[PDB]
Design an enzyme around this catalytic site. Sequence first.
Site, mmCIF file in Angstrom:
data_model
loop_
_atom_site.group_PDB
_atom_site.id
_atom_site.type_symbol
_atom_site.label_atom_id
_atom_site.label_comp_id
_atom_site.label_asym_id
_atom_site.label_seq_id
_atom_site.Cartn_x
_atom_site.Cartn_y
_atom_site.Cartn_z
ATOM 1 N N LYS A 108 -8.182 1.838 -38.696
ATOM 2 C CA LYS A 108 -9.388 1.019 -38.646
ATOM 3 C C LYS A 108 -10.476 1.598 -39.537
ATOM 4 O O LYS A 108 -10.959 2.711 -39.296
ATOM 5 C CB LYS A 108 -9.896 0.897 -37.210
ATOM 6 C CG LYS A 108 -11.140 0.044 -37.078
ATOM 7 C CD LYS A 108 -11.535 -0.132 -35.627
ATOM 8 C CE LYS A 108 -12.874 -0.837 -35.519
ATOM 9 N NZ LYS A 108 -12.800 -2.230 -36.035
ATOM 10 N N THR A 109 -10.837 0.855 -40.585
ATOM 11 C CA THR A 109 -11.829 1.239 -41.587
ATOM 12 C C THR A 109 -11.356 2.437 -42.406
ATOM 13 O O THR A 109 -12.013 2.827 -43.377
ATOM 14 C CB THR A 109 -13.195 1.526 -40.952
ATOM 15 O OG1 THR A 109 -13.139 2.749 -40.208
ATOM 16 C CG2 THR A 109 -13.614 0.382 -40.032
ATOM 17 N N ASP B 76 -15.411 -6.069 -43.520
ATOM 18 C CA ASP B 76 -14.602 -5.590 -42.413
ATOM 19 C C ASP B 76 -15.107 -6.219 -41.120
ATOM 20 O O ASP B 76 -16.239 -6.707 -41.048
ATOM 21 C CB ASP B 76 -14.593 -4.050 -42.332
ATOM 22 C CG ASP B 76 -15.965 -3.458 -42.075
ATOM 23 O OD1 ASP B 76 -16.947 -4.219 -41.993
ATOM 24 O OD2 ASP B 76 -16.057 -2.219 -41.953
ATOM 25 N N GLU B 77 -14.229 -6.231 -40.111
ATOM 26 C CA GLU B 77 -14.432 -6.899 -38.825
ATOM 27 C C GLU B 77 -15.035 -8.292 -38.988
ATOM 28 O O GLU B 77 -15.828 -8.737 -38.151
ATOM 29 C CB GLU B 77 -15.279 -6.047 -37.861
ATOM 30 C CG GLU B 77 -16.694 -5.698 -38.290
ATOM 31 C CD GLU B 77 -16.769 -4.335 -38.940
ATOM 32 O OE1 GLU B 77 -15.700 -3.727 -39.153
ATOM 33 O OE2 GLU B 77 -17.888 -3.874 -39.248
ATOM 34 N N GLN C 137 -9.523 -7.858 -31.594
ATOM 35 C CA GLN C 137 -10.742 -7.113 -31.259
ATOM 36 C C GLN C 137 -11.953 -8.055 -31.218
ATOM 37 O O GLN C 137 -12.980 -7.852 -31.864
ATOM 38 C CB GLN C 137 -10.964 -5.936 -32.213
ATOM 39 C CG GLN C 137 -11.326 -6.234 -33.671
ATOM 40 C CD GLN C 137 -10.143 -6.343 -34.600
ATOM 41 O OE1 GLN C 137 -9.010 -6.444 -34.164
ATOM 42 N NE2 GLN C 137 -10.410 -6.327 -35.898
ATOM 43 N N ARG D 275 -8.179 3.071 -28.397
ATOM 44 C CA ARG D 275 -8.604 4.429 -28.052
ATOM 45 C C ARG D 275 -8.020 5.433 -29.039
ATOM 46 O O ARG D 275 -8.361 5.368 -30.233
ATOM 47 C CB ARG D 275 -8.227 4.639 -26.585
ATOM 48 C CG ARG D 275 -8.840 5.857 -25.943
ATOM 49 C CD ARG D 275 -10.348 5.799 -25.973
ATOM 50 N NE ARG D 275 -10.903 6.651 -27.014
ATOM 51 C CZ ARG D 275 -12.194 6.914 -27.149
ATOM 52 N NH1 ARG D 275 -13.095 6.398 -26.330
ATOM 53 N NH2 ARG D 275 -12.591 7.716 -28.129
#
Lengths: 674, 669
Positions: A33-34, A223-224, A261, A629
């Site tokens: 992620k990223t 992103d996102e 997400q 997590r």
Amino acid sequence: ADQLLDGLNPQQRQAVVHEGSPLLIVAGAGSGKTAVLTRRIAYLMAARGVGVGQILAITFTNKAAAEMRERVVGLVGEKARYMWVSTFHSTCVRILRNQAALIEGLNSNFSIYDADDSRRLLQMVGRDLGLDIKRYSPRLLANAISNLKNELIDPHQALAGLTEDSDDLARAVASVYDEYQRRLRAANALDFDDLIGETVAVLQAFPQIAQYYRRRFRHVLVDEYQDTNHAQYVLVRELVGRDSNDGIPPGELCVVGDADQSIYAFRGATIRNIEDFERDYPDTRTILLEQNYRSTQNILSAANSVIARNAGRREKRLWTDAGAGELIVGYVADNEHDEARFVAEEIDALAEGSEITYNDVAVFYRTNNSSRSLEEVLIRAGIPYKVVGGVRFYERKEIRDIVAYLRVLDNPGDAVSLRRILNTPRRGIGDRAEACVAVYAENTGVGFGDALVAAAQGKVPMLNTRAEKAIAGFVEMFDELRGRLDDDLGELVEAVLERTGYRRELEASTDPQELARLDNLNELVSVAHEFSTDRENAAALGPDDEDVPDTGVLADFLERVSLVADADEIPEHGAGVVTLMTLHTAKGLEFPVVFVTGWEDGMFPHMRALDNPTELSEERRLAYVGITRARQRLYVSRAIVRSSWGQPMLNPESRFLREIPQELIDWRRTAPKP
Amino acid sequence: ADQLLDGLNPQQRQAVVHEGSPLLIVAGAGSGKTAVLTRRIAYLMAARGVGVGQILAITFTNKAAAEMRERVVGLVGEKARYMWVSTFHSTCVRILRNQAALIEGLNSNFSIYDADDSRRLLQMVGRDLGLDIKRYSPRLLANAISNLKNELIDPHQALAGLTEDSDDLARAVASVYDEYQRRLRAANALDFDDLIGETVAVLQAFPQIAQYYRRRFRHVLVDEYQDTNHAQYVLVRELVGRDSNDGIPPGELCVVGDADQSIYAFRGATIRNIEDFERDYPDTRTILLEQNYRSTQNILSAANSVIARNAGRREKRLWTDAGAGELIVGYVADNEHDEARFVAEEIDALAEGSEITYNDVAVFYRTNNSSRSLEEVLIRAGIPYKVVGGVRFYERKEIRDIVAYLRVLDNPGDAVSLRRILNTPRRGIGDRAEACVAVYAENTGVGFGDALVAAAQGKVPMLNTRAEKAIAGFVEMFDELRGRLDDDLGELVEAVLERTGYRRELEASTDPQELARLDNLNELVSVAHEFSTDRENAAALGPDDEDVPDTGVLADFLERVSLVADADEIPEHGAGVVTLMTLHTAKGLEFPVVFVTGWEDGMFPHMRALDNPTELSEERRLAYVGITRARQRLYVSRAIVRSSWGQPMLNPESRFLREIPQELIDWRR
DNA sequence: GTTGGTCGGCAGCAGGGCTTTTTTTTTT
DNA sequence: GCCCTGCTGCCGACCAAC
């Protein structure tokens, strides 16, 4: 050599650059992620070679911006700090600073509001057409004004707001909307959401600036984007993604994310943007993010289960070659949930029992209510500790007063924020009369300006302050203290603000058991002056290129007054002594040690989130993001008898704890609680 | 230790010291009541302790709740905040389903209270206009739906399946009014509602709440049953009671010696709920009670004998002792009800005042509006009748009128009341007062005060808001001149009162449940009351206080200020109180003098309930609670041949009068 | 030619006037 | 003591058919 194609999962290797077309990339669990974003910026630098200064990517968190900047200056290196990449609100203030007032209407010496001050301003303006202090609460007004601002109704909405027919539940706020815009224009300041509405309206109504400010930057990266409301969807359709229709090839417009997400959707985020992106530029390929860096077979299986079967979404088989084992701790039983604490006992006792070095722990909250208070009053036993995300700076009444006093230094006319409270150190101000000389003078025409300086000298209204113009003397002294000023040095509360110094002496004199309040006030003074000491010049400005019109000169805290991205501080020696963080803020951080409450519906679906609304899937998805997590030792726990927050309530058994399988991952085995 | 163990012989506080569910007392009036309750909770304090709510307590309404809370604050050292022990089930269920979540949408909080039972009245008026027939009366038929809900019997299913006689309208309005109010429930002012109902279903619902309920706060204390029924009995058996189903430890359920009062027998309360514990939880042997302080030894012993008539079989071995004693008075003056009773009570009260203070002199009435002008009795002992007005202090009804004479026919001295006119539903929104303009408008005038700025059209405060002067001046001119010219009789709906009722009817035509709808009936009955006053004030067969109409209506208004003031400041010193005692308030007032009348027949009963030997039995115990509602001294007097309007209803003999062996109750004439 | 029917309206004459309580998801 | 309405008995006029 290897820098261009630094070691990674070959999945992103086949994702590669593919420059020359709009690009969409999928996500899921960690999936770097990223980190894939960092590999993307490496792609742009080296694999394709687009340049260095032609970069403006968009994110959703200042912490994310900081971590990606440090990763870039580490791997990418070559300083690369003259140009920058900033988050969504920071891009907002960027396009309102480098593009501050090269346009009609708003001026360059503008301001920004917050949540609490927005609520106060809306409540005050609604008091003019009073609709009870409890019928239409300021929180309700705020969420309603946001979810009507999220659609693109530009601030000429005498048609849009009045388009409603019959209906119930307060469209009158749409009538109040025009006066709300008038009042904020009186202070030349905006709100959170409209801070992009003005920009998109300008980019849609003012064509000359379009395809003109692009001569500075031609590159964009997202992103996102899966987490996106209609307002910023139109933004990316027009502002950052930029080219809609017409046709101009920008610098590698690109997005990443997945609908799983889908946190932060209740109060406005149209999760479909990724689903219907074929409505936008279709020439992109769906990617298959499947592996992970820090997952485990059991937990990845649990995540895939809690993503698979609730209702219709698109998802694929996701797994990784990493090591397996250490089944999830399904140990749900009797002997009390959290009434007799006993959870923090599990965490810390296992911490000293095992090789936990006080450097790793993660437990998520469930509510913004007194869950935090009880969680504290049960972890006070654990000496290794650090509280985080508890809302502790820039919301208290006194500190907001001093922030306003910094803010009143400039911009004559600052709405209700101008006064905050005029009778702050119990001055004796007769809050009446002047509470309505504002409407007195706005009948004449001026809202809250000359009427304020209308005082012993300003007998133009001479509207009988009470009977004695003593309040005229007080407001004379008020404009006197407003006038006096000094440089960005030891005067912010102290030297030329001796009136605030006397505020300090008064509060220190009274201080009923407010000693910790004294020291936190002192710490805030210290941080305020160190921002005038550590930031200052040279260290902050330096020889940096690019042009900024006015920021920096007493605009010091004009920027970063918001910083509204849930900033978090991560030490290393005490990285995991206590890291109680609410799951909403949590976005897949780096704590393998897990003791999250997580489940057992009835509290996991909130008091409002009953039955089957159109957002329970969002709850399952946020649970999935929480369980995303980090690495092993996710020692989760639960009991069977639930009661909390004074009057007890009962808790049914979750389907999410049941959608995860019984045998292939561990579940209840015996009677002990942990 | 036993620092709270007061002077008391063993019998009564055995229920305080002897732990165990099978404990019962036999207690009449003048018992510990909350004294023994607080003593039991303090014994538990010496024992286990609070545990927040380790043992609960069911009680009566706020009239008992407030004094219970005061005793808890005082008698035991601990300050307050044990738990909710508020007005019996009415608050128990409300605080219960606050966290319980099965079917509620907006936290229920329903009451079918005065406004909402009037809503029931209006909806059955509509059904009457639309279904069958008058069905007796618009009143006193809600008993059917009440005991339908009171005993939690099925809504209408087997009731219609019972195939009963021509009363199917009840089943129709039970099928309705069960879902008709189901969309939303709101507002809480009465006791019964469906609150005592549909909560056993919650207890018969998911057993998690039932399991935990007696797991964290165990059990409950049960007071005088009275306002209960067999359904409420199964509630208390299961609401906090365990029924020995799954609970490992038993229940500490002691029972207070509920006497026979049936204050709401009209509202429904059986007798076997208190006298037949044998087919219930273990037999719960009882204990006797001796000490009392209500009446003197002669009066107390004679009351013990009188309550022993035993028309209905009642466990009675209790005796109550006291100090001095005296015989009853024998003053009868051959009817002349008004004049005779007024002169008797006046002479006796003055003789008392030469010896004892007027601080609690009062009288008991039989729910009727009669007797001489109230001015003399009200000025006898200072404070007016603070008995009942249906807590009339609600909406504008009590205040718009009571300021109508402030604005015209005298000075508007109550400037706060004037601001309340400026807080009218008109002046709030309709004829809006412009708070951000009004506050300064009355603030203007340096020597400001009253509506002086509103007076003279505000020429001096013309420094006020300018564009607003149109609407501000218009509303000012309305509120000043339109009321000022009012000099006629001013009743029903006229002057401005017709406008007030007009816009109340305007909000009445809309949705809200009786809101602006019941107050129409309230103002109609208020003008009926002022007409009634005119029957003894203005057109009093020769005006009593009508020295031209202005002073008559003002006298009515001062009577109204007295009624709305009721209990207030000017503490009870000297000429303390005069009140008219009704049965439904017969608890709490010591009442150290009893000049009661009507102990004979003719009104007990009054041809409604003549034979009905069981009904005569609870009327006898009604007489018992009346005679036992006394303090210090008492000298009851009566009159013969009640010639009332044309119906005499001669009552020369009563089953209460002359069955006493005349040791105390003898007229000496 | 005439008494029973049917309403229309009004003076007497009596039943009947009783009821206790308000709070919390987008959160950035 | 005092009023609202239901119940009861009592003048008074128009129709009819026998």
